[PDB]
Structures are given as structure tokens and as C-alpha cells.
mmCIF file of N, CA and C in Angstrom:
data_model
loop_
_atom_site.group_PDB
_atom_site.id
_atom_site.type_symbol
_atom_site.label_atom_id
_atom_site.label_comp_id
_atom_site.label_asym_id
_atom_site.label_seq_id
_atom_site.Cartn_x
_atom_site.Cartn_y
_atom_site.Cartn_z
ATOM 1 N N UNK A 1446 -27.048 -16.423 12.957
ATOM 2 C CA UNK A 1446 -26.843 -14.986 12.969
ATOM 3 C C UNK A 1446 -25.386 -14.608 13.145
ATOM 4 N N UNK A 1447 -24.742 -14.216 12.051
ATOM 5 C CA UNK A 1447 -23.336 -13.833 12.087
ATOM 6 C C UNK A 1447 -23.142 -12.422 11.538
ATOM 7 N N UNK A 1448 -22.291 -11.647 12.203
ATOM 8 C CA UNK A 1448 -22.019 -10.277 11.784
ATOM 9 C C UNK A 1448 -21.134 -10.253 10.542
ATOM 10 N N UNK A 1449 -21.758 -10.393 9.376
ATOM 11 C CA UNK A 1449 -21.012 -10.385 8.131
ATOM 12 C C UNK A 1449 -20.993 -9.018 7.476
ATOM 13 N N UNK A 1450 -19.798 -8.456 7.320
ATOM 14 C CA UNK A 1450 -19.646 -7.141 6.708
ATOM 15 C C UNK A 1450 -18.654 -7.192 5.549
ATOM 16 N N UNK A 1451 -18.926 -6.408 4.511
ATOM 17 C CA UNK A 1451 -18.061 -6.365 3.338
ATOM 18 C C UNK A 1451 -16.832 -5.499 3.601
ATOM 19 N N UNK A 1452 -15.844 -5.603 2.718
ATOM 20 C CA UNK A 1452 -14.628 -4.825 2.871
ATOM 21 C C UNK A 1452 -13.379 -5.645 2.618
ATOM 22 N N UNK A 1453 -12.340 -4.994 2.105
ATOM 23 C CA UNK A 1453 -11.083 -5.673 1.813
ATOM 24 C C UNK A 1453 -10.067 -5.443 2.928
ATOM 25 N N UNK A 1454 -10.535 -5.521 4.170
ATOM 26 C CA UNK A 1454 -9.656 -5.319 5.308
ATOM 27 C C UNK A 1454 -9.055 -6.616 5.813
ATOM 28 N N UNK A 1455 -9.914 -7.557 6.188
ATOM 29 C CA UNK A 1455 -9.460 -8.849 6.691
ATOM 30 C C UNK A 1455 -8.260 -9.355 5.899
ATOM 31 N N UNK A 1456 -8.262 -9.091 4.597
ATOM 32 C CA UNK A 1456 -7.172 -9.522 3.729
ATOM 33 C C UNK A 1456 -5.819 -9.189 4.348
ATOM 34 N N UNK A 1457 -4.750 -9.649 3.706
ATOM 35 C CA UNK A 1457 -3.399 -9.398 4.192
ATOM 36 C C UNK A 1457 -2.549 -8.718 3.125
ATOM 37 N N UNK A 1458 -1.602 -7.895 3.564
ATOM 38 C CA UNK A 1458 -0.721 -7.185 2.647
ATOM 39 C C UNK A 1458 -0.358 -8.056 1.449
ATOM 40 N N UNK A 1459 0.016 -9.302 1.722
ATOM 41 C CA UNK A 1459 0.389 -10.236 0.665
ATOM 42 C C UNK A 1459 -0.768 -10.454 -0.303
ATOM 43 N N UNK A 1460 -1.927 -10.817 0.239
ATOM 44 C CA UNK A 1460 -3.110 -11.057 -0.579
ATOM 45 C C UNK A 1460 -3.425 -9.844 -1.450
ATOM 46 N N UNK A 1461 -3.703 -8.717 -0.804
ATOM 47 C CA UNK A 1461 -4.022 -7.485 -1.518
ATOM 48 C C UNK A 1461 -3.000 -7.212 -2.618
ATOM 49 N N UNK A 1462 -1.724 -7.220 -2.247
ATOM 50 C CA UNK A 1462 -0.650 -6.976 -3.202
ATOM 51 C C UNK A 1462 -0.738 -7.940 -4.379
ATOM 52 N N UNK A 1463 -0.936 -9.219 -4.076
ATOM 53 C CA UNK A 1463 -1.041 -10.242 -5.109
ATOM 54 C C UNK A 1463 -2.058 -9.846 -6.174
ATOM 55 N N UNK A 1464 -3.305 -9.661 -5.754
ATOM 56 C CA UNK A 1464 -4.373 -9.280 -6.670
ATOM 57 C C UNK A 1464 -3.951 -8.097 -7.535
ATOM 58 N N UNK A 1465 -3.691 -6.963 -6.892
ATOM 59 C CA UNK A 1465 -3.276 -5.759 -7.602
ATOM 60 C C UNK A 1465 -2.333 -6.102 -8.751
ATOM 61 N N UNK A 1466 -1.209 -6.728 -8.419
ATOM 62 C CA UNK A 1466 -0.226 -7.115 -9.424
ATOM 63 C C UNK A 1466 -0.825 -8.088 -10.433
ATOM 64 N N UNK A 1467 -1.808 -8.865 -9.988
ATOM 65 C CA UNK A 1467 -2.462 -9.839 -10.853
ATOM 66 C C UNK A 1467 -3.188 -9.143 -12.002
ATOM 67 N N UNK A 1468 -3.879 -8.053 -11.684
ATOM 68 C CA UNK A 1468 -4.616 -7.298 -12.689
ATOM 69 C C UNK A 1468 -3.693 -6.358 -13.456
ATOM 70 N N UNK A 1469 -2.428 -6.316 -13.049
ATOM 71 C CA UNK A 1469 -1.463 -5.456 -13.710
ATOM 72 C C UNK A 1469 -1.347 -4.097 -13.048
ATOM 73 N N UNK A 1470 -1.630 -4.048 -11.750
ATOM 74 C CA UNK A 1470 -1.555 -2.800 -10.999
ATOM 75 C C UNK A 1470 -0.343 -2.788 -10.073
ATOM 76 N N UNK A 1471 0.183 -1.584 -9.802
ATOM 77 C CA UNK A 1471 1.348 -1.408 -8.930
ATOM 78 C C UNK A 1471 1.028 -1.706 -7.469
ATOM 79 N N UNK A 1472 1.841 -2.558 -6.852
ATOM 80 C CA UNK A 1472 1.644 -2.924 -5.455
ATOM 81 C C UNK A 1472 2.484 -2.046 -4.533
ATOM 82 N N UNK A 1473 2.586 -0.766 -4.876
ATOM 83 C CA UNK A 1473 3.359 0.179 -4.078
ATOM 84 C C UNK A 1473 2.450 0.978 -3.149
ATOM 85 N N UNK A 1474 2.916 1.205 -1.925
ATOM 86 C CA UNK A 1474 2.132 1.954 -0.961
ATOM 87 C C UNK A 1474 1.867 1.168 0.308
ATOM 88 N N UNK A 1475 1.143 1.779 1.241
ATOM 89 C CA UNK A 1475 0.822 1.129 2.506
ATOM 90 C C UNK A 1475 -0.468 0.322 2.391
ATOM 91 N N UNK A 1476 -0.734 -0.504 3.397
ATOM 92 C CA UNK A 1476 -1.933 -1.332 3.409
ATOM 93 C C UNK A 1476 -3.153 -0.529 2.964
ATOM 94 N N UNK A 1477 -3.404 0.584 3.647
ATOM 95 C CA UNK A 1477 -4.539 1.439 3.322
ATOM 96 C C UNK A 1477 -4.584 1.741 1.827
ATOM 97 N N UNK A 1478 -3.497 2.304 1.310
ATOM 98 C CA UNK A 1478 -3.412 2.643 -0.106
ATOM 99 C C UNK A 1478 -3.886 1.481 -0.973
ATOM 100 N N UNK A 1479 -3.390 0.286 -0.672
ATOM 101 C CA UNK A 1479 -3.762 -0.909 -1.423
ATOM 102 C C UNK A 1479 -5.258 -1.182 -1.307
ATOM 103 N N UNK A 1480 -5.755 -1.207 -0.075
ATOM 104 C CA UNK A 1480 -7.170 -1.453 0.173
ATOM 105 C C UNK A 1480 -8.045 -0.504 -0.639
ATOM 106 N N UNK A 1481 -7.845 0.795 -0.437
ATOM 107 C CA UNK A 1481 -8.616 1.805 -1.151
ATOM 108 C C UNK A 1481 -8.608 1.535 -2.653
ATOM 109 N N UNK A 1482 -7.438 1.194 -3.181
ATOM 110 C CA UNK A 1482 -7.294 0.911 -4.604
ATOM 111 C C UNK A 1482 -8.309 -0.134 -5.055
ATOM 112 N N UNK A 1483 -8.197 -1.337 -4.502
ATOM 113 C CA UNK A 1483 -9.105 -2.425 -4.848
ATOM 114 C C UNK A 1483 -10.557 -1.963 -4.789
ATOM 115 N N UNK A 1484 -10.898 -1.232 -3.734
ATOM 116 C CA UNK A 1484 -12.254 -0.727 -3.560
ATOM 117 C C UNK A 1484 -12.652 0.176 -4.724
ATOM 118 N N UNK A 1485 -11.734 1.046 -5.133
ATOM 119 C CA UNK A 1485 -11.991 1.968 -6.233
ATOM 120 C C UNK A 1485 -12.161 1.211 -7.547
ATOM 121 N N UNK A 1486 -11.269 0.258 -7.794
ATOM 122 C CA UNK A 1486 -11.318 -0.537 -9.015
ATOM 123 C C UNK A 1486 -12.673 -1.220 -9.167
ATOM 124 N N UNK A 1487 -13.006 -2.080 -8.208
ATOM 125 C CA UNK A 1487 -14.273 -2.800 -8.234
ATOM 126 C C UNK A 1487 -15.444 -1.845 -8.431
ATOM 127 N N UNK A 1488 -15.397 -0.707 -7.745
ATOM 128 C CA UNK A 1488 -16.455 0.289 -7.846
ATOM 129 C C UNK A 1488 -16.555 0.835 -9.267
ATOM 130 N N UNK A 1489 -15.405 1.145 -9.859
ATOM 131 C CA UNK A 1489 -15.363 1.676 -11.216
ATOM 132 C C UNK A 1489 -15.736 0.603 -12.233
ATOM 133 N N UNK A 1490 -14.892 -0.419 -12.343
ATOM 134 C CA UNK A 1490 -15.132 -1.510 -13.280
ATOM 135 C C UNK A 1490 -16.449 -2.215 -12.977
ATOM 136 N N UNK A 1491 -16.628 -2.610 -11.721
ATOM 137 C CA UNK A 1491 -17.848 -3.290 -11.324
ATOM 138 C C UNK A 1491 -17.677 -4.795 -11.259
ATOM 139 N N UNK A 1492 -16.449 -5.239 -11.011
ATOM 140 C CA UNK A 1492 -16.156 -6.664 -10.923
ATOM 141 C C UNK A 1492 -15.618 -7.032 -9.545
ATOM 142 N N UNK A 1493 -16.519 -7.440 -8.655
ATOM 143 C CA UNK A 1493 -16.136 -7.824 -7.302
ATOM 144 C C UNK A 1493 -15.098 -8.941 -7.319
ATOM 145 N N UNK A 1494 -14.145 -8.871 -6.397
ATOM 146 C CA UNK A 1494 -13.093 -9.877 -6.306
ATOM 147 C C UNK A 1494 -13.318 -10.794 -5.108
ATOM 148 N N UNK A 1495 -12.664 -11.951 -5.122
ATOM 149 C CA UNK A 1495 -12.792 -12.915 -4.036
ATOM 150 C C UNK A 1495 -11.421 -13.388 -3.565
ATOM 151 N N UNK A 1496 -11.278 -13.557 -2.253
ATOM 152 C CA UNK A 1496 -10.017 -14.004 -1.674
ATOM 153 C C UNK A 1496 -9.397 -15.116 -2.513
ATOM 154 N N UNK A 1497 -8.058 -15.129 -2.584
ATOM 155 C CA UNK A 1497 -7.315 -16.133 -3.351
ATOM 156 C C UNK A 1497 -7.390 -17.518 -2.717
ATOM 157 N N UNK A 1498 -7.048 -18.539 -3.496
ATOM 158 C CA UNK A 1498 -7.080 -19.914 -3.011
ATOM 159 C C UNK A 1498 -8.265 -20.132 -2.076
ATOM 160 N N UNK A 1499 -9.440 -19.680 -2.503
ATOM 161 C CA UNK A 1499 -10.634 -19.834 -1.692
ATOM 162 C C UNK A 1499 -11.541 -20.937 -2.201
ATOM 163 N N UNK A 1500 -12.527 -20.562 -3.030
ATOM 164 C CA UNK A 1500 -13.484 -21.512 -3.603
ATOM 165 C C UNK A 1500 -12.839 -22.438 -4.630
ATOM 166 N N UNK A 1501 -12.334 -23.574 -4.160
ATOM 167 C CA UNK A 1501 -11.688 -24.544 -5.037
ATOM 168 C C UNK A 1501 -11.630 -25.918 -4.379
ATOM 169 N N UNK A 1502 -11.594 -26.961 -5.202
ATOM 170 C CA UNK A 1502 -11.541 -28.329 -4.702
ATOM 171 C C UNK A 1502 -10.509 -29.149 -5.470
ATOM 172 N N UNK A 1503 -9.783 -29.999 -4.750
ATOM 173 C CA UNK A 1503 -8.772 -30.829 -5.380
ATOM 174 C C UNK A 1503 -7.859 -31.497 -4.370
#
């Protein structure tokens, strides 16, 4: 039993910024601004994102 909740908060300014720029989006603004953005994108497009350098083996 673990308290698992969704949201792009745990992430870090660097991480969030990385993704945004990755999809071709401006990484300008404060943490909040960035967070809200990702949330809006996924909601609109409908493509959930996953933390970087996560699910991988090598």
C-alpha cells in the first residue's frame, strides 16, 4: 500500500524544461508555468509522458 498520485511536480526544473524543449516548446517561465504546460499538452494531445532516463536497460 503506497500513496501513489499523478502529477508533474516531483519532476525538476531541468527535467520539465528538457521535455518541453524536446517537443519543441519554449522552456521560459517559472516551475509552475512549466508544470501547467505539460499538463495542458498531455490533456490536449492525449500522450502521457514519462520521466527521462527512466525505463531503460544497458
